[PDB]
Symmetry: C3
Subunit: 426 residues, 3 copies
C-alpha cells in the first residue's frame, strides 16, 4: 500500500550476516588415451595408431582443463602477495572475530573446520594406491595434485582477513594504511547513506548484533554445501562412466580383449579389436566433451568469485544484491573444499513509522529544499531527517537551499526556517 | 572540436525510454534414447544394450538442461516473494502507467499483450496430441511444461511494478517503505548529479515527456523480438534434425527397421540393425552436444537478466550503458515469451551552449574553488553552476572553498566573491 | 600491523599506467564438409549422401561461429557512430598524448605499431594462393575476411580517443560537451575522494608523472601479448589436426581414396570408402565441437571487453580492480591484432605517515564529528583532513557537525572548535 502525502522511515536497524558459497575448481584429473583403450596390448596399440592423432588431441583437451584448474584457484585467492598477520591484542572495539580467524592450536578457523567436514570425497581408491603403477591399475585414469595446497590457501585467506581488519580496503589498492576498526565501520556506514554518529552512539548494540549473527552462522552450517558437493558428485559420475564402459562388448565377443587376442586367428582378432577400439574411443570422446563443458561452467564461477573478492572483500559494493541482501558494509572470506565461502555483512532497516511529508517548504516567498534527507511532520511540527534512519532535526538555513519560489512547486507547505545567527546577535 | 578555455553546458533535457530484450529460458524438451533408436523393437533393444550406458549418460545430459530451464526462470523473476498490488487511485503526480500495469479486463498489461503476439511458435503437433501415447507417436521426443506458468510470472512482474512505484527500491533491500512517486523521482535525479528543484519546477514537462515516450514504445513494438524468435528457430532446427535422421540408411538396406527384421535372416538383420543403431546414436549425440552448448549460452543470458533485475529495477545503476543509454533513472520489467523485457528510463542532455570557463577565482590573494559545479562567464559576469544543467548562480563564500593562493593556479582569473553576511550587518 | 588509536595517511602520490589485453575475435574460417570428406569424388559423394544431413548441420555450426566473430568485433569497437578528430593545437595542459594518437605519416599510433608487430600469424598459405581454386587446393578449408578491416577499427579507436580527450565521458551518454583537459582531470580526482586543489597545485608534477608512465609502456611492450598469441596458436593446432587426419587409413587400405576407387571392385571400394567417410566425418565432428567451445570462450571475453569500453573508457569506474589496480581515473583504448588493449590510468597513494586519531571531539559538552575526513594529531595540535591525501586544516564549525553529547562516544577527546564569525565581530 502507498499514498501521495506520506512517507515511511525506519527508526531502528539490525545487522545481518549471510553466507554465499561458490565453487572455484574441481579435482585435477586426466586420462592416458592409449592406456585406456589398449591396456598393455601391443596388437591393440598397433591398431590404434592407424586412426591418426585422435588420442593426442583428446589428451591435449584434458590437459588444458587440468591446467585451468590452478589458474582458477590462484586468480581467486592469490590476489594479495603480501602476507599479513593479526596482533595478539584482539581489541576491535567489541567486535569478536575469534570464529573467523585461524586457530593457533591445521591453522584454520572454527568455521573453516566446519566446512571441511561437510563435503564428502574412484578418487579415494587412487589415493590409497599411492605413479605409473597406479595409472596401470586404474586403466589410464590418473589424479593430479594442485599447485596450491589447502595450507597455502589458508595463508592467503588469513592475509586477506588480517588486511581487512587492520587497514580496511586500502591494502587492496596500494599500501596498507592502519585504522582503528570502529572508525573503519563509520565510513562503511557513510557508504550506505547513514551518518557517523549512528555507529558511535550505538557501537555497543552493533557489536552485540554482529557477534550474535556470527554465532548463528555456526548453527546454520552445523544443521548447506550442496553446491560444492554437486560438483564432486558430477565428476564421480563421469569417471564411473568411463570405468563401466570398459566392460561393454559393443558387438564384440568379449570386452576382455585378451580373449580376442587368444583363441581367434590374427585377422579375426583384429576385426574384433578394431570394433572395441571404436567403441572405447567414442566413449572417451563423450567423457571429454562433457568435461570441457562442465569445466567452462566452473571457470565462469571462478571468475565471479574473483570479482566478488575484489568488490566485496577488498572494497564496498554499491551493486544491489551483489554482496548479499540489504546494504553492503563488508565481507570476510573463508576457505572451503575446492571453493570459497563469503560471509557478507549487511545493514537492514527494521521498524518503520508513517510520517506526513512535503516536497518543499515556503518561508518568506521562497521555496526551501533539503540539502539531504526529507521533510516530515509528527502531526504538529516539521523536521528534516536522513532517509535511512529516523533522526528529526530542526529545519534551518544550514539544512536547506533556496530555488525558485512558492508559486511553482505543487507540494509546497507553509512553515518557518530557523536562522542560526540573528537570534544571538540581537 | 574542443578548446582549452571554453565549456559546453546543457540548458535543457529530454526523457527517453528504451527497450532491452533478453532470453531467459527455452522450451523444456527431452528424448527417450531407447525409444528413439529402437522404436518398439525387442531385437533392437537387445542389440542396443551391448553398447553399455550411452543412453543413460545422454538422458542425464538432457534432463540436466530441462531442470536448468526452471532454475533460470525463477532466478530472474522470483526475486521478491511478497506479492504487492497497486491502489485504484492511480495518482502518481501526472505519470501515466496504465500501459505497463495489468489490465483487470489473462491479467496482463497492454504492452505485454503486444509482445506475446509477436513470437511465433514439432511443438505445435505435440500440443495437439495431448503422455506415453504422444511419446510413441513422436519417436521418443517429448515436451515438458514449466514449473512457473505465464500467469505466475505475470504475478511476479506485477508485484515488482507495484513495489517500484509505491516504495521505490527499498522493498528490494528490506521492508517496503512507501513514498510519493514525485519524491521518488527527485532522489533518482540526485543520483545522476542533478539537483531536486529541476524536477519539481519542471514536473509537468517531465511527466508529459515520459507519457509520450511510453506511447512511442507501443508504436515501436507494433511496427523487434528477433532475439527471442531466434532461440525458438534454433530449437526447431535441432528437433527437425533428429526427425529427419530417422529416414537415413547410413549404409543400411532400409531406415524402416521392420524391413530388416523381416526378410533377412536373424544374423543378417542383426548386422544391418547394429549399423542403424550406430548411426542413430551418433546423430543423437550430435544433437545433445549442440543443445548443451546452446543451453550454456541461455544460462549466461539468464544470469545477466537476473543481474539487471537487481541493479536496474530494484535500484539505480551507476554503470555506463548497463541500464540503457544516457543517465539511468529507473526501469520497469515486462513479461515475454520465454524471456524478459526491460523498459529503461534515462535522462539525456539536450541543447548545450558555449561558455568561457576558468579553474579557479582569485579574490583577495586567495584562490577560491567551487564546492560543486563549474565557473562560467556569459561575457560580462562570472557564475557558478551544476555541470549537467545550466543554472547560473552568484559566486559566494557558501559556494566555494579556499586552498593555496593566486600565484599557484595556472588558469586563475580575477573576480569578486560575495559574502552573504556583512552587507546586512552594516 | 595495526592499533586502535592511530591512523596512517599518505602525504604524496604517484600516477601509474597499466596495460590490460583482451581477445575479441578469431580468424573467420569454415569447412566445406563434402569437399573435405569427398575430394572431387563422385562415388564418395554418393556414399556420403546416405548418411543424411550431418554435413548440413556441421556447416551451420561453423557458419554461426564465423558470423559471431563480426558481431563480437562491432560490439566492442563500434559503440560510437560519430567520428571525431583531434585538433592540431595539441595543448592539453602539459599532457603528452602523441604516443597514443594516430600518426599522420597506415594511420596508427606509435604504440599500436608496436603491438601489431608482436603477434605472429595454414593461413599464410591460403593468403598466398589468393576463391574456389583455393578451396580445392586446401581440401575444403577456407578463410573468410572480416567486415571491419584494421583501418576501420583504427578509425573507431581514433574517434573514442578524440572524444575522451575533448569531451570526457559526456559523448558516451549524449552530445559531446567540450571541456579543458586539466578541468576534466579535476573531476576525475573528485571521483576518487580527492579534492580539486590537489590537481591544480600539482598539475606540473602530475603531467610529468603521466608522460613518464607512457614512455615506460613502450619499453614494457618492446621488451606481453601471449594472451592474443595463444588464441592464434590454438586455432593453428585445430586446423593442423584436420589436415593430418586426411592421411589416416582408420583400417582402410589407403587414405588416398583414388587407390580404392581403382584396383578394387565396385562393392569392395564402397566398403573401404564408407570406412574412410566414417573416420573423416568423426574427425570433422571433433574439430567442430572444440571450435564451438573455444568460440564461446572468446565471446565471453568480447562481452567483457565491451563492458570495459563502456565503463572504463566512456566513464569512470568505482569497481575495485575492474579498470586496473589503484583508484581509477581514466582509460585509453588501442587497437590490436584480433583484440583490444586498454591503458588504465590510476591514482596510487605513495608515502604515508602515522598520526594519532580520535572518533570525535568534545567542545562545550557536545560531540563534534567531521563532515568529511578524519581527526588527527601531530603530537600537539588536532587537525581535520581528507583521507586520501594529508592536508591538515583547522577544526572549525564549518568542518564538523554536532550529534549527541560527550558522555556517549567512547573515543572522545577534549579540544576546541574554531568559530569563524565572532572573532571578527568583537
Ligand atoms: C569471543 O567469542 C568466543 C566464542 O564464543 C568466546 O569464547 C568462549 O568464552 C566462554 C567464556 O569464557 C567459554 O566458556 C567458551 O568455552 C569459549 N568458547 C570457545 C569456542 O572458546 C570468547 O570468550 C569471546 N571473546 C570476547 C572478548 O568476547
Ligand atoms: C532496536 O532493536 C534492538 C534489537 O535488535 C533493541 O535491543 C534489544 O532491546 C531489548 C529490550 O527491549 C533487549 O532485551 C535486547 O537484549 C536488546 N538486544 C540487543 C542485541 O541488545 C533496541 O533496544 C532497539 N532500539 C530501539 C530504539 O527500538
Ligand atoms: C512533535 O515534536 C515536538 C518537538 O519534540 C513536540 O513538542 C514538544 O513536546 C514535549 C513533550 O513531549 C514538550 O516538553 C516540548 O516543550 C514540546 N516542544 C515544543 C516546541 O512544543 C510535539 O509534541 C510533537 N508532536 C507530536 C504529535 O508528537
Ligand atoms: C493514461 O493513458 C491512457 C492511454 O493513452 C488513456 O486512455 C485513453 O483515454 C482517452 C480519453 O478518454 C480515450 O479516448 C482512449 O480510448 C483511452 N485509451 C485506452 C487504451 O484506454 C488514459 O485516459 C490516461 N489517463 C490519464 C490520467 O492520463
Ligand atoms: C525544453 O524542451 C522541451 C521539449 O522537450 C520544450 O517543451 C516544448 O515547447 C514547445 C514550444 O517551444 C511546445 O510546443 C511543446 O509542446 C513543448 N513540449 C512539451 C513536451 O511540453 C521546452 O519548452 C524546452 N525548454 C527550454 C528552456 O528550452
Ligand atoms: C550576464 O548576466 C548578467 C546578470 O543577469 C546580465 O546583467 C543584467 O542584465 C539585465 C538585462 O537583461 C539587467 O536588467 C540587469 O540589471 C543586469 N545586472 C547586472 C548586475 O548588470 C549581463 O547582461 C549578462 N551578460 C551577457 C553578455 O549576457
Ligand atoms: C611529446 O612526446 C614526444 C615523444 O617523446 C616528443 O617527441 C620527441 O621530441 C624530441 C625533442 O625534440 C626529439 O628529439 C625526439 O626525436 C621526438 N621523438 C619522437 C618519437 O618524435 C615530443 O616533443 C613531446 N611533445 C611535447 C610538447 O612534450
Ligand atoms: C612526491 O613524489 C614525487 C616523485 O614522484 C617527488 O618529485 C620528485 O622530487 C625529486 C627531488 O626530491 C626530483 O629529483 C624528481 O625529479 C621529482 N620527480 C618528478 C616527476 O618531478 C615530489 O617532490 C614528492 N613530493 C613530496 C611532498 O614529497
Ligand atoms: C603541529 O602543527 C602546529 C601548527 O603548524 C605546529 O605549531 C607551529 O609551529 C611553527 C614552527 O614550525 C610555529 O612557527 C607556529 O607559530 C606554531 N603554531 C602554533 C599555533 O603553535 C606544531 O609545532 C606542530 N607539532 C608538532 C609536534 O609538529
Ligand atoms: C503505514 O500506513 C500503511 C497504509 O495504511 C499501513 O499499512 C502500515 O501498517 C502503516 N505503518 C505504520 C507503522 O503505521
Ligand atoms: C494526494 O491525493 C489526494 C487524493 O487521494 C488529493 O486529493 C491530494 O490533493 C493529493 N495531494 C497532493 C499534494 O497531490
Ligand atoms: C502561505 O502564506 C501565504 C502568505 O504569506 C499565503 O498567501 C498562502 O496561501 C499560504 N499557503 C498555505 C498553504 O497556507
Ligand atoms: C561551440 O563551439 C564549437 C567550436 O567552435 C562549435 O562547433 C559549436 O557549434 C558551438 N556550440 C554553440 C551552441 O555555440
Ligand atoms: C589556451 O590556448 C591558447 C592557444 O590556443 C593559449 O594561448 C592560452 O594561453 C591557453 N590558455 C590557458 C589558460 O592555458
Ligand atoms: C589580479 O589582481 C592583482 C592585484 O590584486 C594583480 O596584481 C593581478 O595581476 C590581477 N590578475 C589578473 C589576471 O588580472
Ligand atoms: C607506523 O606504525 C607501524 C607500527 O609500529 C610501523 O610498522 C610503520 O613503519 C610506521 N610508519 C611510519 C611512517 O612511521
Ligand atoms: C586502545 O587499546 C589499548 C590497549 O592496547 C587500551 O588500553 C586503550 O584504552 C584503547 N583505546 C581506546 C580508545 O579504546
Ligand atoms: C573534558 O572537559 C570536561 C570539563 O568540561 C572534563 O570533565 C572531562 O573529564 C574532560 N575530558 C577529558 C578527556 O579530558
Amino acid at each position: 500500500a502507498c499514498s501521495n502525502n506520506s512517507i515511511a522511515i525506519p527508526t531502528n536497524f539490525t545487522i545481518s550476516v549471510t553466507t554465499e558459497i561458490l565453487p572455484v575448481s574441481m579435482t585435477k584429473t586426466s586420462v592416458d588415451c592409449t592406456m585406456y583403450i589398449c591396456g598393455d596390448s601391443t596388437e591393440c596399440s598397433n591398431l590404434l595408431l592407424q586412426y591418426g592423432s585422435f588420442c593426442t588431441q583428446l589428451n591435449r583437451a584434458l590437459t588444458g582443463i587440468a591446467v585451468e584448474q590452478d589458474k582458477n584457484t590462484q586468480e581467486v585467492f592469490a590476489q594479495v602477495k603480501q602476507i599479513y598477520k593479526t596482533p595478539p591484542i584482539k581489541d576491535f572495539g567489541g567486535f569478536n572475530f575469534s570464529q573467523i580467524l585461524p586457530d593457533p592450536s591445521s591453522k584454520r578457523s572454527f568455521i573453516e573446520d566446519l566446512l571441511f567436514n561437510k563435503v564428502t570425497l574412484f578418487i579415494k581408491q587412487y589415493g590409497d594406491c599411492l605413479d605409473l603403477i597406479c595409472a596401470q591399475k586404474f586403466n589410464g585414469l590418473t589424479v593430479l595434485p594442485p599447485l596450491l595446497t589447502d595450507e597455502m590457501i589458508a595463508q592467503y585467506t588469513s592475509a586477506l582477513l588480517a588486511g581487512t581488519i587492520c587497514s580496511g580496503w586500502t591494502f587492496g589498492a596500494g599500501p596498507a594504511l592502519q585504522i582503528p576498526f570502529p572508525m573503519q565501520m563509520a565510513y562503511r556506514f557513510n557508504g550506505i547513506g547513514v551518518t557517523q554518529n549512528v555507529l558511535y552512539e550505538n557501537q555497543k548494540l552493533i557489536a552485540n548484533q554482529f557477534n550474535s549473527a556470527i554465532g548463528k552462522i555456526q548453527d546454520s552450517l552445523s544443521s548447506a554445501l550442496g553446491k560444492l558437493q554437486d560438483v564432486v558428485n558430477q565428476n564421480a559420475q563421469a569417471l564411473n562412466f568411463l570405468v563401466k564402459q570398459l566392460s561393454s562388448n559393443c558387438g564384440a565377443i568379449s570386452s576382455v580383449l585378451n580373449d580376442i587376442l587368444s583363441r581367434l586367428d590374427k585377422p579375426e582378432a583384429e576385426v574384433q579389436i578394431d570394433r572395441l577400439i571404436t567403441c572405447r574411443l567414442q566413449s572417451l570422446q563423450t567423457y571429454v566433451t562433457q568435461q570441457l563443458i562442465r569445466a567452462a561452467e566452473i571457470r565462469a564461477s571462478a571468475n565471479l568469485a574473483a570479482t566478488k573478492m575484489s568488490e566485496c572483500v577488498l572494497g564496498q559494493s554499491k551493486r544491489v544484491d551483489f554482496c548479499g541482501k540489504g546494504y553492503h558494509l563488508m565481507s570476510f572470506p573463508q576457505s572451503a573444499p575446492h571453493g570459497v565461502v563469503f560471509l557478507h555483512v549487511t545493514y537492514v532497516p527494521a521498524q518503520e513509522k508513517n510520517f506526513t511529508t512535503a516536497p518543499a517548504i515556503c518561508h518568506d516567498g521562497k521555496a526551501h529544499f533539503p540539502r539531504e534527507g526529507v521533510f516530515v511532520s509528527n502531526g504538529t511540527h516539521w523536521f528534516v531527517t536522513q532517509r535511512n534512519f529516523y533522526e528529526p532535526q530542526i529545519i534551518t538555513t544550514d539544512n536547506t537551499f533556496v530555488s525558485g519560489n512558492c508559486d511553482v512547486v505543487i507540494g509546497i507547505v507553509n512553515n518557518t526556517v530557523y536562522d542560526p545567527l540573528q537570534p544571538e546577535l540581537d
